[PDB]
Amino acid sequence: SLNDKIVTISCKADTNLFFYQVAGNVSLFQQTRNYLERWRLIYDSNKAAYKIKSMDIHNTNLVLTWNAPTHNISTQQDSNADNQYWLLLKDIGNNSFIIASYKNPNLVLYADTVARNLKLSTLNNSNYIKFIIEDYIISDLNNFTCKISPILDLNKVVQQVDVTNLNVNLYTWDYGRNQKWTIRYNEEKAAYQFFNTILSNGVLTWIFSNGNTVRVSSSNDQNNDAQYWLINPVSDTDETYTITNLRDTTKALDLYGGQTANGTAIQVFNYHGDDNQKWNIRNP
Numbered sequence: 001s002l003n004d005k006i007v008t009i010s011c012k013a014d015t016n017l018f019f020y021q022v023a024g025n026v027s028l029f030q031q032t033r034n035y036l037e038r039w040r041l042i043y044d045s046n047k048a049a050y051k052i053k054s055m056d057i058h059n060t061n062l063v064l065t066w067n068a069p070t071h072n073i074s075t076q077q078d079s080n081a082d083n084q085y086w087l088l089l090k091d092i093g094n095n096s097f098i099i100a101s102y103k104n105p106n107l108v109l110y111a112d113t114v115a116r117n118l119k120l121s122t123l124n125n126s127n128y129i130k131f132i133i134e135d136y137i138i139s140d141l142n143n144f145t146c147k148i149s150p151i152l153d154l155n156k157v158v159q160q161v162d163v164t165n166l167n168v169n170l171y172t173w174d175y176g177r178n179q180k181w182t183i184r185y186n187e188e189k190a191a192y193q194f195f196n197t198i199l200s201n202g203v204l205t206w207i208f209s210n211g212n213t214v215r216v217s218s219s220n221d222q223n224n225d226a227q228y229w230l231i232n233p234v235s236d237t238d239e240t241y242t243i244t245n246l247r248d249t250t251k252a253l254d255l256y257g258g259q260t261a262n263g264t265a266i267q268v269f270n271y272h273g274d275d276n277q278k279w280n281i282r283n284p
Contacts (some may be wrong), residue, residue: 002088003043006055008139011111012096012130018139019064019118021054024075026064028116033140039064041088041133049085049102051078066101066120073109073118088133095187096130098123137233141281142185145197147173149280151240153260158253158279160196166216168204170255170264180284183231191228191246193219203227206245212267214253229253231281240278244271252277 009019011028018037020029029037038055052064054075062075066083078084085102086109099109101120110121111128123129134142148158150170159179161167173179177198184193194204196216206226207213219227228246243253245268252271256264271277 001043002041002050002133005041006038006136007041007133008037008136009039009052010132010134010139011113011128012094012132013111013127014113015132017111017113017116021056021062021075023058024062026073026075026118028111028113028118031139038136044085047085047102049087051080051084052086053078066103066107068103071107071120073120091130094130095132096127097133098129099131137231138185141183141192141231143182144281145180145182145284146281147180147284148194149173149282150255150260151275151278151280152255152258154280156260156262158266160198160202160216163198166202168214168216168266169262170260170266171262175284183281186222186228189222189225189228189246191225192231193228195219204229206247206251206268208247212251212254212269214266214268234273234278239280239282241281242271242273242277243279253279 011017016030017028018031020027020037035055040053042051042053054062056062061078063078063084065074065076067074068083082103087100089098101107107120108123108129110119112119155173156170157173157179159171161169180197181194182197196202201219202216203219205215205217207215208226225247230244232242234240245251250271251268254267254269255276256267258276
């Protein structure tokens with residue numbers, strides 16, 4: 001559920017524009033992958049409504065606020081006022097939310113992507129009243145091209161061996177397409193895939209018919225859970241994660257034996273959060 005979740009909020013009408021907070025101003029801005037675009041949702045079960053709290057640091061507890069009687073939006077000090085509560089109405093099937101004012105539910109948030117701001121409007125069938133509300137990790141990682149390193153050796157990366165050898169092992173970073181992965185979140189599966197960039201449609205897979213083996217395999221389908229993964233941030237790190245398999249979430253991506261020699265296998269294994277199951281996901 002959404003209570004106490006830290007999310008980004010982006011525009012269905014422009015998925016590269018995010019709710020951005022600075023100095024009491026709420027605006028629409030390109031992706032920053034930082035606190036300026038992160039919001040905590042705070043549920044009141046009696047109101048059946050949420051406050052949308054900025055993770056701003058400069059100071060204070062600022063929440064998304066309707067500046068009635070204008071149709072403008074800002075961030076103001078939380079006083080639990082009705083103009084700081086919002087109905088989050090999930091448009092089921094459309095991966096989107098309509099965000100209605102608790103004070104005046106006739107009015108909903110509307111993205112003015114020319115002025116790069118939000119206003120309140122009545123409803124219509126356009127995408128300008130629809131918003132993607134996601135865990136910030138999903139948002140930060142979706143469509144991100146990365147290299148993946150074990151924390152035990154940040155100079156080596158998880159790689160496909162070569163264009164037609166779909167085995168996956170550890171090797172020194174060498175700038176190759178086989179050493180880069182594009183992360184894609186699947187809404188329907190609630191999990192991610194890692195597409196190797198040397199191939200068009202090859203994804204990191206647990207080959208469970210062969211023990212703990214991990215290989216790249218074609219993504220022809222959304223039905224094989226073993227081609228999907230959960231990406232779990234490790235607390236009190238910048239960019240370190242565990243990677244568990246959707247077919248069995250007690251199985252984690254695992255650097256065999258904690259060994260860091262070139263050619264060490266990448267496998268899955270019983271997930272206990274050891275250092276050989278922690279991965280740095282970052283820019284190439």
